[PDB]
Structures are given as C-alpha cells and as structure tokens.
Amino acid sequence: VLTAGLNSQQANTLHAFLDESRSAALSTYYIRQVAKAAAAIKSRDDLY
Amino acid sequence: SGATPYHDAYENVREVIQLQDPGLEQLNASPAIAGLMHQASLLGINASISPELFNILTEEITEGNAEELYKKNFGNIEPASLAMPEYLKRYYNLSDE
Amino acid sequence: EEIDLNSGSTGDWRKTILKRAFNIDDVSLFRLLKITDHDNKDGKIKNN
C-alpha cells in the first residue's frame, strides 16, 4: 500500500535503502546458520 | 544470530513513512489518528523494531523461564560463551565503546 | 483474474501493482474505472 504511493525518486531511495538493510540481515543469518564451520567466518569482512 | 529478526515488510513500511513525512509532522498535526496507536508501537515508525523484536522487548524474564528463554532468544549456543566480551562483541557486531 | 477496484475494497498484489503503475490511490482508481466504463455495475474487472 505504501510503496505504491511513492514517486520515482523516493522509490529509488527506498530500494537502495532496503538492499543495504537486507544485506546485513542475510549476512548475519548466513554466517551463523548456513556458513560451513570449516570457514572461520565471524564477520561480514570475513564473509567478504 | 546477532539479534536479527529481520522483517522486510516492516522496513518497507518504516521507510515509506519516513519518505512521505520526514519528521512525522502530519502526525503531530493529526492527533486523532496518531492517538489510535500506542506510543510503544509508534516508536517503530522511527526505531527499527520488527514485531518479533517488539515481543522480545516486552517479554518478561523471570527465574522460572530463564533457561527457556535463553534457548529461545539466543539459540542453543552456550551461555558461557555469550558471557565472553569478545564473543558478545562479535555476536552483535558491537563497538568497544 | 479479477481485480476489485471498488474504492472500498481491500487490496492484494494485483491491485497494488495497478496502483503502482499509475501512482494513484484506490479512491481515484475507482473513479478511473468509471471514466473508462460507465456500464460496469460493480468495481470488478478482469485482468485483461
């Protein structure tokens, strides 16, 4: 309902924002729940 | 996992409200509507608080369920490792300050 | 597929996309339907 009401620049800003937020979440989840323990990953820098 | 009950739909809602009204002025000007919601939830307009987090924040911690909650909030890790300041720092991606 | 354009309808993803495509709300979308079709006795259209 809300994203449909945005103009194009607000939408571009929104999408940029969300991707940054999603990365932090996906990365953290991945590191703790998915990443193989063989890889000593404790951070986003190590995931990189 | 680093406290990450990430809710994308929540963030879409939160960001749009900030994009449409960057200071919530319309709400300041329209108390009939703002007053329909409890302040604890209005907090999430600005604060990054997903409904799962909201329920965690309002969760009662007592002696009887302390072990249970550990398992349900941190997961089955080890309370002794969470206790280590380095572990803690990495777990929540914290600064030293 | 049916899309309910009654201004009083609740949404779904198809309805949201249509609003998004035009950057308009449900009240003005309903009126848009009446501009295009003065015979439709309801707000429902198929996704033709």
Side-chain angles (χ1 to χ4, degrees):
Chain A
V1 170
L2 287 171
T3 60
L6 297 178
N7 68 35
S8 65
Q9 296 304 314
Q10 288 169 309
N12 289 342
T13 299
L14 175 64
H15 290 301
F17 167 76
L18 293 170
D19 285 347
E20 293 175 0
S21 293
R22 288 177 178 180
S23 180
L26 292 170
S27 296
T28 302
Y29 182 85
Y30 180 83
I31 292 167
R32 290 294 305 163
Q33 300 297 304
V34 178
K36 187 174 181 177
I41 301 168
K42 295 187 176 297
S43 69
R44 290 172 69 187
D45 284 344
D46 297 309
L47 183 59
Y48 168 58
Chain B
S1 301
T4 56
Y6 179 78
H7 187 305
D8 195 64
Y10 170 79
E11 289 298 329
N12 288 342
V13 171
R14 173 173 170 266
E15 188 63 15
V16 171
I17 297 300
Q18 294 296 329
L19 291 167
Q20 291 297 125
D21 186 354
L24 308 182
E25 184 62 15
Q26 187 65 235
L27 291 172
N28 288 336
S30 59
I33 304 303
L36 294 171
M37 300 180 80
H38 194 281
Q39 290 175 346
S41 68
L42 292 173
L43 180 60
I45 293 167
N46 296 325
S48 182
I49 302 172
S50 67
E52 188 68 21
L53 179 58
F54 184 84
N55 284 332
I56 293 168
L57 291 171
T58 60
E59 186 176 63
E60 182 177 354
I61 299 165
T62 189
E63 183 65 19
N65 65 355
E67 184 179 4
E68 178 183 352
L69 292 178
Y70 175 83
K71 291 178 179 175
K72 289 179 175 175
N73 290 322
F74 296 92
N76 294 318
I77 296 168
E78 171 55 59
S81 67
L82 269 292
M84 294 186 286
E86 186 173 3
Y87 189 91
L88 180 65
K89 180 181 174 180
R90 292 184 193 279
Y91 181 82
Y92 294 106
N93 195 33
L94 305 175
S95 68
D96 294 291
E97 293 79 4
Chain C
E1 298 86 356
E2 293 178 354
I3 301 170
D4 185 345
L5 302 181
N6 285 283
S7 64
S9 70
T10 63
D12 61 55
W13 72 268
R14 289 192 295 274
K15 179 67 174 292
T16 300
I17 292 296
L18 183 59
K19 286 189 282 182
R20 180 186 180 276
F22 301 154
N23 300 306
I24 64 174
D25 67 14
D26 292 280
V27 174
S28 64
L29 178 55
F30 174 76
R31 185 170 292 275
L32 184 60
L33 178 61
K34 289 293 188 178
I35 292 169
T36 57
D37 182 347
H38 295 285
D39 297 304
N40 193 330
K41 304 299 183 184
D42 201 338
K44 297 192 285 288
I45 62 169
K46 294 181 180 177
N47 188 36
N48 195 283

